[PDB]
Amino acid sequence: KPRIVTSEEVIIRESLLPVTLQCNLTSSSHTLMYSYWTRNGVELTATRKNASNMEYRINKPRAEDSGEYHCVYHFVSAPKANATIEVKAAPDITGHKRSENKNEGQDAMMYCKSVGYPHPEWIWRKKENGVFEEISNSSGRFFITNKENYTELSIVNLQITEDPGEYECNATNSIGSASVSTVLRVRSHLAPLWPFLGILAEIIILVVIIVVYE
Amino acid sequence: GEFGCTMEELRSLMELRGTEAVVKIKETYGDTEAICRRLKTSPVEGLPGTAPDLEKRKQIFGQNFIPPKKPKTFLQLVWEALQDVTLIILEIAAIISLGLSFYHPPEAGWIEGAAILLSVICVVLVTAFNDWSKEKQFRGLQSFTVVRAGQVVQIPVAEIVVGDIAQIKYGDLLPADGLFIQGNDLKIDESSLTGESDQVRKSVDKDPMLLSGTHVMEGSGRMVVTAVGVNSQTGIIFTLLGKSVLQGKLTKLAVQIGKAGLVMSAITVIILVLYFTVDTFVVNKKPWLTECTPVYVQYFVKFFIIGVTVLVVAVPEGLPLAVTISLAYSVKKMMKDNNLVRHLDACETMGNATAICSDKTGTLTTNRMTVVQAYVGDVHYKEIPDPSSINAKTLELLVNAIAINSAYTTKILPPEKEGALPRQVGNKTECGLLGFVLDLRQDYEPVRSQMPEEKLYKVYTFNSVRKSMSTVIKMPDESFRMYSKGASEIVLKKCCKILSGAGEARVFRPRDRDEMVKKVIEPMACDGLRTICVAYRDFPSSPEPDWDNENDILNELTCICVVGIEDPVRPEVPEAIRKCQRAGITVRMVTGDNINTARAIAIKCGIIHPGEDFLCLEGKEFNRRIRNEKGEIEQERIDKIWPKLRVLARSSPTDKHTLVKGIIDSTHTEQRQVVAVTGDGTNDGPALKKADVGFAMGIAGTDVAKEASDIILTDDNFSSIVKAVMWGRNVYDSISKFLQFQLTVNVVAVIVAFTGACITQDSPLKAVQMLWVNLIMDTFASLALATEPPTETLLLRKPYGRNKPLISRTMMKNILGHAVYQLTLIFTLLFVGEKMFQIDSGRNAPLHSPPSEHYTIIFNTFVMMQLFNEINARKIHGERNVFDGIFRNPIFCTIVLGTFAIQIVIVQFGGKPFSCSPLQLDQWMWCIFIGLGELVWGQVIATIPTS
Ligand SMILES: *[C@@H]1O[C@H](CO)[C@@H](O)[C@H](O)[C@H]1NC(C)=O
Ligand SMILES: *[C@@H]1O[C@H](CO)[C@@H](O)[C@H](O)[C@H]1NC(C)=O
Ligand SMILES: *[C@@H]1O[C@H](CO)[C@@H](O)[C@H](O)[C@H]1NC(C)=O
Ligand SMILES: *[C@@H]1O[C@H](CO)[C@@H](O)[C@H](O)[C@H]1NC(C)=O
Ligand SMILES: *[C@@H]1O[C@H](CO)[C@@H](O)[C@H](O)[C@H]1NC(C)=O
Ligand SMILES: *[C@@H]1O[C@H](CO)[C@@H](O)[C@H](O)[C@H]1NC(C)=O
Ligand code: BEF
Ligand SMILES: [Mg+2]
């Protein structure tokens, strides 16, 4: 079994200093063919050379760069050796929904995405009064379907009395945490009626001024 | 040394007519026969041989051919339309915007410049095409023997040279000017040149002046040519010939709007520069030595570009296209009232005209001698009666007497051209009686046909001493019948008896019966009429008296009919003049005819009333009084005459030109004058060119008068001048309705842009949205307001004037009042609109975000208020009811509904290109509510008295 000596794990902070990851193939009796870096199972572009000792440099380390890296060694007639260098950073929410405006009795969905390893756990908290309290499933209409990064919340049969408010999405990992807020609007069914009663309330005014003046 | 040069300059017998012609002839030269000896010609077999050298030497006088004008090509019309005061400025702004769009010192601009250029191209193309089509339509409507060597031979007209000896007969058209050698009582009609309705008699001594273009009506003679080419009286006037009142007002408004926009741009640039200077220099306190060199200049250039951007918003770009389409529509509508407009800029002038100068012969009268009232059988009819009024054989006797007495060569024929008055080819005064007979529904042709010239026994011809031509025949029976017509008193003195009543022929008594006929005839001549009477005589069968004896045959006549002959006024002229005078217009008559006929027709038409409050002059005494002792036309002398002058008689074309010029140029009155001139003759050529508007009679007008005019009356109806006034006041209204609607969009847009550039950093109204609002929607809005039908209540106002501003006080009140409401609503929706509608505020965006519902609501509301202001823009006075007559115009409703539907489509399915987001149903009814509030605010505005 080939021996690979890897660099220590690096935690990506707000520092702008570049980060270098190292693997050293100290012992190998097989004729090496090529090697490459991989992140989350995906080969990084332009990392295939001879590289008996290979380096990968991150010039602007960010939360999106952090992940489970590997330096794979492919030989002519030997099994590949992968090893692992884990890069950890606090989660950073990339995209969300600013607001969800929906009418009564439909389905409303809100989503949040995050980046960085380890993959964060998601907590949804509606803003009850001035504090963020956890939502309650006391009506059987809330569905939280959380995946590795994607996290969706669905509400069915929206009610104007309780549903409207602010919903917070939380992502927490070993290092840090971040959150975003979304405001949900539920519109009444008789909403178009009020402008209609005002449109013909000024038509009556128009056909009284003109006909009195003749 | 040199042969006799051109006659009109070196011996000016031309241009000086009357008895004064021979006055100069006798003192300077011989007896009009030595004048031929002066040239290389003789009265008999003149110009002995062709001799091409001699012909070419004589052709230095002229060619006898006037080259026709060359029609202008479409590209030439486009080139002429390009050079405008407004259109040059708009192109400059478009090029500036296009150039500054690409300035990115180390989308926007690409839209405004293209839109401006497209609108300019549309204006140019529409104007050029309309002028080309109108001129091409006009061109379609409009349209002899000489003694060469011994034996007379037909020669083409163009080869006539000075000295030619020409034989002229009846019905001919004179090709060139000349003198009179010898002839048998030539009578010619010079109404188209001189303006005199009376047929002129050319003799060797009284007036031997022959003019080109006049029609010789009776007699034959011999003439020698003197003025061949453009040197003739028609050619001189032809060669003398080659901005509107509305355009001056439009350019003045344009410069005022430009100055206002420039002030706004300067204010915004000053605000930005002051903000930068205050912020940076005070708090940070930069060294200001070398660091500022790139940064400060780039910032100042950016602020200047922002100011230039604000400047373009203020300028109205759809105004020229709106005016052009409104004018084109009005011209097309006016063409159906038998007014042919030629330049598309003359359709408005007649609306604001303050005076009219009218020719008499051909314009106010029919130029045809007719019998109007008649005294027959002791019954005087002021109007021509029906054929069976008296229903006696006396009418048969009258018809036979008129037909046989004279009707040999003088005949009346159908026009042979559809849409024209009946044409006569004989003596004009004689066919008045034939016209009377024809209008009595009796045919004179059978009577004439049965008696040829061979069967005529004796025909005594009208001459100097006889003065009463007569015809005596015998064939119908064994007795003799003689007919004699002539002057009233001349033939009445020889009327021993009179055929009185429907019964038996009574006797004529000079003591008592003469008083009644004098009392009948005197008012006739009082009203300007000419009295002609007819009588008949019978001779005994056995024996036969000596017909050479003129003593007895002249006397012993039985008078049968007395008629009144005149050149009548057109039937529609009196009421047309009455309607124009009520609209604030003053009508004056300028004519080349006598003073008595001019005064009579002026009394009949209604130009003057008895009392002599006004003044009537002649041509000679108008020139003498108009000039000072130095001999120069002084504007101070004209101002004493034209205010009170009503009739000008015996006036040269120069006199008409002088009068029109003096009226136009004078500043003595309170309001400056606009003068229109109506005509049909060549002598009206100059006056029709100097006037602001020129109307030319279509069927009766000549080529010179039709070419110099702007509007042609295709059916020469004087009541179609009143419809030119009412279509010119409707044009001016439909343009001031569009100014009310357009100038309230520009104020709101410029203030929103200024606030979004200075205070905030982005505007709710994008570029393509305002392209849709200003270019496409406002053009259709102007098309809708143009098609409002005119009404006969427009003819109750007074003319406005040359220097009255376009934007009146009520229009200013409307513009300001509606701008206040629109700005208040827009700002309220911009700053607190997301709390009312319960949506996300879209005030600040990262320029990488989809369109917001907060801003689409503002765009939709703005368009809705413009849509509902298109209704308030229909009343430019203080009218409360803006829905009056809305359904008489279906184009208005069609355009409004189409605009609303297209706006719905644009908002719903516009997307990112239009910067629009789809709206809900309840969010759209609020836009309609706010837009409909404009109508309710219009009444609040209208309540405020502008006085
Ligand atoms: C790199 O080159 C060396 C020297 O030839 C060789 O031993 C080694 O196997 C190569 N590694 C590759 C080709 O991956
Ligand atoms: C790791 O590899 C790099 C690159 O060849 C080399 O410089 C370094 O000395 C190696 N470190 C060890 C501990 O082998
Ligand atoms: C390398 O092989 C190991 C075998 O234990 C496996 O766990 C790892 O995921 C592999 N790495 C990659 C990048 O496939
Ligand atoms: C809420 O209860 C319903 C009961 O039908 C269930 O389907 C749903 O998954 C529950 N949601 C959560 C977040 O537990
Ligand atoms: C979320 O994870 C999936 C699966 O690994 C990946 O395809 C996707 O790009 C991730 N999304 C973001 C926003 O990082
Ligand atoms: C997210 O969750 C963590 C852990 O419960 C909590 O302490 C924190 O206040 C929440 N918000 C943020 C922004 O981290
Ligand atoms: F033809 Be008008 F009388 F000059
Ligand atoms: Mg005339």
Residue numbers in the entry:
A (entry chain B): 147 to 360
B (entry chain A): 22 to 127, 148 to 184, 192 to 290, 338 to 1042
Direct quotes from the study:
Plasma membrane Ca2+-ATPases (PMCAs) have a crucial role in this process by extruding Ca2+ against a steep concentration gradient from the cytosol to the extracellular space. Native PMCAs form heterodimeric assemblies with the small transmembrane proteins neuroplastin (NPTN) and basigin (BASI). Here we present the structures of mouse PMCA2 in the presence and absence of its accessory subunit neuroplastin in eight different stages of its transport cycle.
Upon ATP hydrolysis, PMCA2 undergoes major structural rearrangements in the cytoplasmic domains, causing the opening of the M-domain to the extracellular space. In turn, this triggers the release of ADP and Ca2+, and the binding of counter-protons, finally leading to the E2P state. During transition into the E2P state, M872 rotates away from the PtdIns(4,5)P2-binding site, thus allowing N841 to change its position and to interact with Q837. The transition to the dephosphorylation intermediate E2.Pi exhibits relatively minor movements, mainly pertaining to the closure of the ion-release pathway of the M-domain.
